Structure formats: structure tokens, C-alpha cells
Amino acid sequence: MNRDDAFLTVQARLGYDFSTSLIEHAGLAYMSGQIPRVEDKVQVCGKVGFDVDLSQAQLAASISTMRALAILKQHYGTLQVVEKVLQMNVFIHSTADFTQQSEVADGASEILYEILGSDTGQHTRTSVSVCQLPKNASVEINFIVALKQ
Amino acid sequence: MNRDDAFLTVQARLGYDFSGKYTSLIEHAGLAYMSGQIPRVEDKVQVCGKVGFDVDLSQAQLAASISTMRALAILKQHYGTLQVVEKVLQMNVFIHSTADFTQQSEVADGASEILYEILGSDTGQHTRTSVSVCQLPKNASVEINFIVALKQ
Amino acid sequence: MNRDDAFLTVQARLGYDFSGKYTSLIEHAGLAYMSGQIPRVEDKVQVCGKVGFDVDLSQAQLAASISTMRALAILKQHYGTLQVVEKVLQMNVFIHSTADFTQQSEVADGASEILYEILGSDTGQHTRTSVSVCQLPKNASVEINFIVALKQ
């Protein structure tokens, strides 16, 4: 399966309709932080490790990533424009005893590998816990993406 | 048109003078990377405390405005004029808040609005991220960093 | 004499051996993006805990130093030598701390000093952001990421 069809499959599996947010400069796309919202309605709200568990937090990370990918696909028409996801910053709304930030971020990284593949899905990342996020969201993720020239 | 006079006007409206182990700004390949700015002006961090506890939404928006004006003053000092700005590529807003504060977007609007008023809706467009942190240098309420594309 | 010798000297001074699903470093257009580094060396996240509670300022500075040395070791492994570094464009420092900790700048100085000691006051110049977070992977006390310009 190619990148755009794989995207469609992940979108159907999650059960959401995903189809300034992004600025392009010098072959790079800078993307605003994305919370797990669709239309407006924030989809996974709460504090990870208290009222949100690890599985749900990974889901939230997946949704934020799919939103970013949808924004790219809408702006450029196809995910074939992605050369590399250079950087992914994951901010997790959690308790002060939660230590599984890597596993939560794996929920986003897996989406990248599933849609972009072994090589193009490679990315650097940072994962930290914050004490709150916009509209009580549980995860927020931003990206810098290299675009194919 | 006249971004520098607009900057001076915001400085007058806010009532602070901005024309007063790391580096504030580094340029590479036509981009200026800027260090995180807390609201320090005329010495003294201006709006200290925890948003949603001893700092309210309006004061937090002011704090965001001050951090942004600080960044613009640094740009004006390095490049002589805000006409050097092609685009604010990225603005990261870190808000020192309580665990029930969910209006991070409204706090960040205090910075974004300054960018739009001074630079215009075109050169003022920017991506942004706004998250709550549990503390900041010198008990500051907001800290903001930037990546700015430069003209020519 | 050069930066690699300085790295070995600082490594001896610190007393850890650094030569021993994401990617640590990706290069694009002459920039190396680096993942956030917690103070992991000799298969132990070193230090760990909440700064201002069970980690004091000195230990947090050591943690910041270890994360920085890790980043430098990754660059040296990828490129064979630290002579490829032109500038550390950006260093973001996230500190696991209490809600009363306000010395984030002093913690980040532990990283900045490593950069200056190994790379020099010129190549070691960097912009920086330092904020407190409420937790980190594996209960770590500091996590640091980097954007580094390469000489070309």
C-alpha cells in the first residue's frame, strides 16, 4: 500500500474524519502543535495516569499525528511530498508519577512508520510531561517536516 | 508599511521601555533562532506567578505581549529594523499555570495579536504551540521562543 | 589540541564512559536535528528524581552535563569527529522539578558550560530555552534536545 492509501486505512481504523497550521520555508514545513481534536470536540481529554490510561494516551498521540498528516495532505494533495519528518515534539498532560512518556510517543511514531514506511518515517523526537494542555487535551504534538524538492 | 512605528506605538501603549550562559539570537541560512524570553523589561520580570492561581488570564496575556515585544526589540537591535522579518516561522509558548487551566490558546493570543498588529496579517503569520509548564525561570508566568525567517 | 581531545578530557573529568522507536539524529540541509536526551550513560539513567525535592541544583547541573555529553558522543559517532560542528543553533532544556523551583537557568548552565568547554566560545554559542516540566521518561531529572549546524 502506498502512503495515501495507508493514511486512509489508519483514518478508517480510528473512526474519525480528518480530511496558521503550517508554514513552508526553504523546503521545510513547520507545523503548529496539534491536540486530538476533530472539528472542534477534543477527543481524548484528561490527565494521563489519572483518568486517561496508557492505551488511551497512545490513541491521543495517534490522532494528533493523523491531524498533522491530514494537514500536509490537504496542503500538498499527497503525502508523497514528505521527504522526512525531521522533528516531533510530544507534550503529555500527565500526573507527577507518570514515567511512560516514551510509550505514549510510540503511539505517534507507529503511525509515522505505518504510513510513511521504515525509512521515510524515521524522525527525531522529544517526549515530556506537562501539567495541562489546551482544552484539557491529554497530548499535544508539533512537527518539522522536510519536503521533497 | 511602517512596522517600526507600530512597534514604538505598542511600546507606548504598554508603558515599558524596550529600547534598553547563552546567546539571545543566532542567524543561520536566513533564519534567526531566538532564545526563550520571559517578560523582563526595565529589569524585573513583570508578571510573575502561576496562571490560574495568582495571575489571571488578562495578566497572562500581557505577559505574553511583553515576551513578544522583547523578542521584537532583540530583532530590531540585531538587524536595525523590523522590515528584516519575512515570516515568524514558529512561536513556542510555555505557560506557568495550575492543573485546571485550559485557556493556553487565549494566553498565546496575547503574543500572536502583537505579531499581527505590528507586522501585518501577511508577514505576521506564524505556527505556534502553547502548553502549560509547572515552573519557569524566576517564577515567570510565560516564556516564549521563536524561529524567524529573514528577508534577503 | 582540538575538540575531540577536549571531549576526552571533559569525559575523564566527569567520570562516565560515553564511548560505549525513534532516531537519535537526522541530518537535513546542513543541520543535524537531535532527539531529546535524558542522562543515560553506562546503562543507567543517572541522577533521576524531581529537582528541588530529591535532586538538588548541583545534581541537576550534572544531569544536564551528562545529557549534553550524550548528544556530543552521538555527533562524534555519526560524523567521526566534533570538528564538523559549526554552531549549536538551539538547545531546549526540560527540567523535572517542583512547583517552587525557579533556578532553571542555573540548571541549563550545566549544559551550556559543557558546550563552551568542548566546542569553544565561538562554535559553542547557542540559543537556549529552559522550562520546568512535571515528569520525564524513566523519572529522569533533565531532558535536552539540540539543533546543530554542520560545517559543510
- What is the CATH number for C43? 3.30.1330.40
Helix H or strand E encompassing A144? strand A139-147
How far apart are the CA of C77 and the nearest CA of chain A, in angstroms? 16
In this structure, the number of other CB atoms found within 10 A of the CB of residue C59 comes to 19
The per-residue b/e assignment along B25-47, b for 16 or more CB within 10 angstroms, e otherwise, is bbeeeebbbbbbbbbebeeebbb
Task: Return the bridge partners of A120, or none.
Answer: none
Using a 10 angstrom Cβ sphere, with 0-12 exposed, 13-18 middle and 19 or more buried, the burial of residue C91 is: buried
Q: State whether residue A110 sits within 8 Å of chain C by CB.
A: yes
Does C101 map to a domain?
yes
Q: State whether residue C134 sits within 8 Å of chain A by CB.
A: yes
What is each CA distance from A59 to A42, A63, A119, C21, in whole angstroms? 13, 6, 23, 16
- The grid coordinates of residue B143 equal 516564556
Handedness of CA C131, C135, C137, C142 (dihedral sign): positive
The radius of gyration of chain B from alpha carbons, rounded to an integer in Å, stands at: 15
Does C43 map to a domain?
yes
Q: How many domains does chain C have?
A: 1
Does C13 map to a domain?
no
Q: What is the DSSP string of B72-128?
A: HHHHHHHHSSGGGEEEEEEEEEEEEB-TT---HHHHHHHHHHHHHHHHHHHHT--EE
Closest to A37 in 3D by CA, of A12, A60, A54, A56: A60
Provide the residue range defining the domain that includes A52. 3-19+28-147
Closest to B96 in 3D by CA, of C100, C85, A128, C23: C100
DSSP letter at B38 equals -
Specify whether the CB–CB gap between C115 and C67 falls below 8 A: no
Of A87, A123, A130, the CB nearest to C133: A130
Chain C environment of A131 (Cβ under 8 Å): 134
Of C25, C29, C33, the CB nearest to A27: C29
What is each CA distance from C139 to B72, C4, C46, C88, in whole angstroms? 37, 31, 10, 27
Closest to B62 in 3D by CA, of B12, B132, B109: B109
Helix H or strand E encompassing B37? strand B31-37
Q: Which residue from C minimizes the CA distance to B25?
A: C127
Does C16 map to a domain?
no
Specify whether the CB–CB gap between C135 and A130 falls below 8 A: no
Q: Which amino acid is at A94?
A: S
* d(C-alpha B51, C-alpha B102), whole Å: 10
Specify whether the CB–CB gap between B21 and C112 falls below 8 A: yes
In this structure, the number of other CB atoms found within 10 A of the CB of residue A84 comes to 22
Neighbours, chain A (3 or more CB pairs < 8 A): B, C
Which method was used?
X-ray
Specify whether the CB–CB gap between B128 and B91 falls below 8 A: yes
This structure's resolution (Å) is 2.1
Does C18 map to a domain?
no
* d(C-alpha A22, C-alpha A29), whole Å: 6
Chain A environment of B102 (Cβ under 8 Å): 132-136
What is each CA distance from B114 to A31, B69, C24, in whole angstroms? 20, 8, 36
Cell 500500500, residue located: A1
Helix H or strand E encompassing C144? strand C142-150
